[PDB]
Amino acid sequence: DNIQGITKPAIRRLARRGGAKRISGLIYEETRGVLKVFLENVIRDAVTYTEHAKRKTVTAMDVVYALKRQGRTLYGFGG
Amino acid sequence: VLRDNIQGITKPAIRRLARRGGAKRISGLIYEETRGVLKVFLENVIRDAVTYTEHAKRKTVTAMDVVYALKRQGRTLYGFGG
Amino acid sequence: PHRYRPGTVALREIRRYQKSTELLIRKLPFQRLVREIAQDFKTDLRFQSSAVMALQEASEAYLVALFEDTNLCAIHAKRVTIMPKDIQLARRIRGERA
Amino acid sequence: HRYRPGTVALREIRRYQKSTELLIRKLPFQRLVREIAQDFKTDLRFQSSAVMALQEASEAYLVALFEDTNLCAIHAKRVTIMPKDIQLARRIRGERA
Amino acid sequence: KESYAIYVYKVLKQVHPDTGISSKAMSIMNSFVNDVFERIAGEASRLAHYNKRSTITSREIQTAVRLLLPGELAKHAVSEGTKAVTKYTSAK
Amino acid sequence: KESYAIYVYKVLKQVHPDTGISSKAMSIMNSFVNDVFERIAGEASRLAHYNKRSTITSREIQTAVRLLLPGELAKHAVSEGTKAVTKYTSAK
Amino acid sequence: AKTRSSRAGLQFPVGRVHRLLRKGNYAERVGAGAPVYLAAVLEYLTAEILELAGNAARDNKKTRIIPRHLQLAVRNDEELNKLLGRVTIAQGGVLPNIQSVLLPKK
Amino acid sequence: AKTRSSRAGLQFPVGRVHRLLRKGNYAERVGAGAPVYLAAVLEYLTAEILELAGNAARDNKKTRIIPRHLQLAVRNDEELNKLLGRVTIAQGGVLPNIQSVLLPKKT
DNA sequence: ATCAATATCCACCTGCAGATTCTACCAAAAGTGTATTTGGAAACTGCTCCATCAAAAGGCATGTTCAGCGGAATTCCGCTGAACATGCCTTTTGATGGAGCAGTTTCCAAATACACTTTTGGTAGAATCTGCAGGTGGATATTGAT
DNA sequence: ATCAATATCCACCTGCAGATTCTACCAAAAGTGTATTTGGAAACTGCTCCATCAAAAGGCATGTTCAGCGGAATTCCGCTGAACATGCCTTTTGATGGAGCAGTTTCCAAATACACTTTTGGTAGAATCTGCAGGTGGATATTGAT
């Protein structure tokens, strides 16, 4: 049950960097839900690239390639 | 009478577009806002197409030059080749 | 002396146009606009008919969709009248302004 | 002494907009990755950098999403972001249009 | 000027024997086949590169399909494809 | 494992002589170069196919650059590119 | 001789797909099954859209499938819709849809 | 023997880039001018971003450019920002930016 | 506007980790130099199909009337921010075993490389054919007034 | 509820624009048969680094209290867009030179391919360096109560 590790305080900090001044009480569960779908989709592809390489280890490159497929190119980890 | 080209894209037409888009009531200011948007849209696409044109040393923009441009803008279009 | 109430015909138009597929902008005027915009990129150009057509199909498709997001934004604000602030918001969230 | 509601909020915005550390606790995030992954494929290992790459993208995405959300609330003449706003932004973004 | 039209047409007859298709519609299916072909080819292409392989095999097409198509559509696409490679290999 | 680091560093020293760059930052710059390289090469690749050409020349690279980069960046990338080719074209 | 499409038991041109993979510069080499598999996937998807586009025509009492019939077929199917989420089908129109709040207050 | 980079008056490696163009399979063949031109564009661009990076560095009293500096440089420049409109620079943060309606008082 | 509680700003300071810097080894590159191949500019030209012009045709501009929508003003409940007390779980510094990714040699199934023969999918010009789009008629529903 | 006005639906009709089906010419495929090459998998395994266990302590999450004020429901009015019928300028639709789009033939500058030679960009290892994180204090903003 780890989606709860995404605490209310952290989700708040994130909204802050995002420039939000006041946060509804329902935001938190919604955000956890939004984040879970993001991760599932990024991991599904990453892990797909891992398998194709017949590896048991998901590598940063696997994540960098998955992010690129999804239109969310990431700079900094070899990609 | 003599008006301007973007103005050629008329309110009745813009209203029709908005309708297919499901808009029930249209503010008076929408029409000019739209023209402006449509112009930025065409410039972006045509700029890319004419670039494909010159590259192939032609003087005629081809439906494929437009399809290839649309595809770059992530605005893929089926039906005109490609 | 008959008269339909505000909105009655509009809705009727929505129903009509969401049913059909013809282009809703007049061909010639569009063609002029396309050529005028192009003249700014390279002079003395020619356009296959199919190219101008393709462009119109794309443009209407784009605008119709933008009007949809725009209508959603108008609604978000508890209105039923799309305004520029609405096209503006939509285009920013789409990344066209971002 | 007590600051009026919203003053600290603004203080926090300036604070976090000025910095770059991730804002989600590391270990908890790692567990969420491992859980979602295991549900896709059992017996999997992660290079530490792979987990960090996923965290950098996630928060980058979530922060971008809140700005849009914030703009949607304000579009509603409100200053409080609510679920319906997150939802209007993803529908427009195309994550469920 | 090659096109997938005739094969498109064949497929149409196995599915709806008594149904026809206009030009513009045939032209849309053609755009559709090319588009998917290019998307799958491309992803297979990268797949190989990431793994420093020189060959795009049926394995690459498969993973590409998994990555490109939606869940159920993928499930079938994958079987259909596996079936074609098998029947092909099992035949003189 | 090759990277563009040394070259990034040389250019860094040319513009800001007394500034360094941290490791993570250099990593990012390295991602930047590979990214733009791929995008440009890719545009080139298609451009060539679109014209039934099997050779990617300084010219495909140029049009790709015009399609990919914004206003002034493109305007200048092309000058520097042209410049570099003319000079190389005259050195031998 | 017997065509590869026949052996693979497909309507789509395996020979052409193979050719198109080579001339496309997707890789140095191309295995023998790749064009088979690929061709098989393109036939299947083609069958899916025509199948639905077809039902779309019968539902409108028409026998000849037109663009409208492809648009109504694609956007009314979650997966095909996602697969073509960034594709405009010319002469397709849109699906009939009016936000509730816009309907006359009965 | 003079490197093609020097013949071309460039700092970026003309050969490495000609080589990568081959290995990436973009065409049957790659003309000689292509890598010279592409290395220049890559060089011209890294210079541009580094110019802006170093400034941000200077602006924050730092001598060593770090991610935040690259981000600030990219997001504050219309063109680079567009060129990287769908790129995420790890550890870069966001630009300080607070919507007006959120600031207190009036006037 | 004066005043006190707090946060913000910031130049000074030095331990520590991450950054710059030699020393030598190098096989992987990148370069220099014949031999062979050919991709595509370059000029010539026939045939579309694009631009232009004139008349068969169908929609847009315009003014007025008012109903109903958007937003200003008012109001009140309650939910969300700020502050505080408490305590646990993240993180941090280290160490260890072993998994599995990654280097290296070996060798065969499979892929490139012509060369030759067969068949097939595209184009072209001719004639035949038909799914359906509008046009009509009459019935029935919807809307708006009373 | 009661018509009156219009929009909307449907069953049928039928002309023709566009879809079908025939034929022949054919280069470009695509299949086949042989000779040669090679990518990458199997087998052995060196060695990075991932998982994981332990301990420590304090950065932070959790949970509660309390009320300031933002959200949202309601009333109200002015004004802005919708409907509409009046009338005309524009667009549209069908017909005719010519300008480029391509199809072809040529032949050279330029791109492989192959064999050496030599120069460079990684890096493994140990060593000295240096920018700045993080701690500190105290002087200057910022807030909010009165």
> Is strand J less than 7 A from the beta carbon of G64?
yes
Cα(H88)–Cα(H84) distance, rounded to whole angstroms?
Answer: 8
Cα(H11)–Cα(H39) distance, rounded to whole angstroms?
Answer: 9
The Cα of B46 is separated from the nearest Cα of chain G by a number of Å equal to 17
Cα(C48)–Cα(B61) distance, rounded to whole angstroms?
Answer: 6
Q: Domain spans of chain B? A: 1-82
Cα(H43)–Cα(H12) distance, rounded to whole angstroms?
Answer: 6
Q: How far apart are the first and last CA of chain D?
A: 48
Residues 3-22 of D with CB under 7 A from strand I: 3-9, 11-12, 14-15
Which of H46, H75, H101, H102 to mutate: most A Cβ within 10 Å? H102
CA-to-C1' distance for A19 and I76, Å?
29
Q: Which long-range contacts (CB under 8 A, 24 or more apart) does C6-11 make?
A: C7/B24, C7/B25, C7/G104, C8/G104, C10/B19, C10/B24, C10/B25, C11/B24, C11/G98, C11/G102, C11/G103, C11/G104
C20 phi and psi, to 5 degrees?
-95, 175
Distances (CA, A) of H14 to A12, F81, H18, H33: 49, 12, 6, 10
* The one-letter amino acid at F67: L
CATH number of the domain to which G30 belongs: 1.10.20.10
Cβ partners under 8 Å of residue F86, min gap 6: none
Chain E contact set for H25 (CB, 8 A): 45, 49
Place of tokens 């109430």: C5
List the structure tokens of B14. 């813009």
Strand partners, B77: G88
Q: If DSSP codes are grouped into helix, strand and coil, which group holds residue A20?
A: coil
List the structure tokens of E79. 């079987």
CATH number of the domain to which D4 belongs: 1.10.20.10
Cα(E59)–Cα(E48) distance, rounded to whole angstroms?
Answer: 10
Cα(B74)–Cα(A71) distance, rounded to whole angstroms?
Answer: 11
* The one-letter amino acid at B56: A
List the structure tokens of H59. 């602006």
Cα(F50)–Cα(F52) distance, rounded to whole angstroms?
Answer: 6
Judge: domain F1-92, CATH 3.40.109.10.
Answer: no
Strand nucleotide closest to residue F89 (CA to C1'): J110
The angle subtended at Cα A68 by Cα D91 and Cα B77, nearest 5°, is 60
Neighbours of F1 (CB within 10 A): 3
> Is strand I less than 7 A from the beta carbon of E57?
yes
* The one-letter amino acid at G20: L
Short-list C10, E85, H19, CA closest to G9: E85
**Dmax of chain E from CA atoms?**
49
CA-to-C1' distance for E6 and I123, Å?
15
Chain E contact set for B80 (CB, 8 A): 27, 31
Chain C contact set for H85 (CB, 8 A): 95, 98
Cβ partners under 8 Å of residue C10, min gap 6: B19, B24, B25
The Cα of B67 is separated from the nearest Cα of chain C by a number of Å equal to 7
Residue C74 exposure: Cα atoms within 13 Å on the Cβ side? 25
Cα(C74)–Cα(C81) distance, rounded to whole angstroms?
Answer: 6
Chain C contact set for H86 (CB, 8 A): 95
The angle subtended at Cα E58 by Cα E55 and Cα E59, nearest 5°, is 85
Does any CB of chain E come closer than 8 Å to the CB of residue H104? no
The Cα of G22 is separated from the nearest Cα of chain F by a number of Å equal to 12
H-helix segments, chain C: 8-17, 27-39, 49-76, 84-94
| H or E element, residue E33 | helix E23-50
Short-list H83, E51, G26, CA closest to F40: H83
- What kind of architecture, by CATH, is found in domain A1-79? Orthogonal Bundle (1.10)
Cα dihedral across residues H49, H86, A48, E46: positive or negative: negative
Chain F contact set for H17 (CB, 8 A): 37
Residue-wise over A10-33: b if at least 16 C-beta within 10 A, else e? bbbbbbbbbbbbbbbeebbebbbe
Short-list H43, E14, C87, CA closest to F4: H43
Q: For chain H, what is the domain count?
A: 1
Chain H residue nearest residue G24, CA to CA: H27
> Is strand I less than 7 A from the beta carbon of A76?
no
> Is strand J less than 7 A from the beta carbon of D47?
yes
CA-to-C1' distance for A55 and J46, Å?
18
Supply the range of the domain harboring residue C84. 1-98
Cα(C57)–Cα(E32) distance, rounded to whole angstroms?
Answer: 17
How was this model experimentally determined?
X-ray
Identify whether the C-beta of residue C51 lies closer than 8 Å to the C-beta of residue B38: no
**Resolution in A, one decimal?**
2.8
Does any CB of chain E come closer than 8 Å to the CB of residue H25? yes
Residues 13-32 of C with CB under 7 A from strand I: 26
> Is strand I less than 7 A from the beta carbon of C81?
yes
> How many contacts does B have with G, using Cβ atoms within 8 A?
27
By Cβ distance, the residue of G87, G91, G99 closest to B76 is G87
Chain E contact set for H24 (CB, 8 A): 49
The Cα of H67 is separated from the nearest Cα of chain D by a number of Å equal to 9
Judge: domain B1-82, CATH 1.25.40.10.
Answer: no
Contact C71 B13 (CB under 8 A): no
Identify whether the C-beta of residue C83 lies closer than 8 Å to the C-beta of residue B30: yes
CB-contacted nucleotides of strand J (7 Å): 5-8, 18-20, 29-32, 39-41, 49-51, 60-62, 68-72, 80-85, 89-93, 99-102, 110-112, 118-123, 131-133, 143-145
Helices H33-59 & H67-75 angle (0-180, nearest 10): 100
Strand nucleotide closest to residue B2 (CA to C1'): J89
Cα dihedral across residues C67, C69, C75, C79: positive or negative: negative
Cβ partners under 8 Å of residue E38, min gap 6: G24
Contact A69 E67 (CB under 8 A): yes
Cα(F86)–Cα(F84) distance, rounded to whole angstroms?
Answer: 6
Supply the range of the domain harboring residue H33. 1-107
* The one-letter amino acid at D16: Y
Residues 65-94 of H with CB under 7 A from strand I: none
The angle subtended at Cα H60 by Cα H55 and Cα H65, nearest 5°, is 55
Place of tokens 């290992």: D45
Chain E residue nearest residue G13, CA to CA: E7
Chain E contact set for B76 (CB, 8 A): 35
DSSP tag of F91: -
SS (HEC) of chain B: CCCCCHHHCCHHHHHHHHHHCCCCEECCCHHHHHHHHHHHHHHHHHHHHHHHHHHCCCCEECHHHHHHHHHHCCCEEECCCC
Q: Domain spans of chain F? A: 1-92
Contact A75 H86 (CB under 8 A): no
Cα dihedral across residues D56, D59, D63, D66: positive or negative: positive
Residue B75 exposure: Cα atoms within 13 Å on the Cβ side? 25
SS (HEC) of chain H: CCCHHHHCCCCCCHHHHHHHHHHCCCCCEECCHHHHHHHHHHHHHHHHHHHHHHHHHHHCCCCEECHHHHHHHHHCCHHHHHHCCCEEECCCCCCCCCCHHHCCCCC
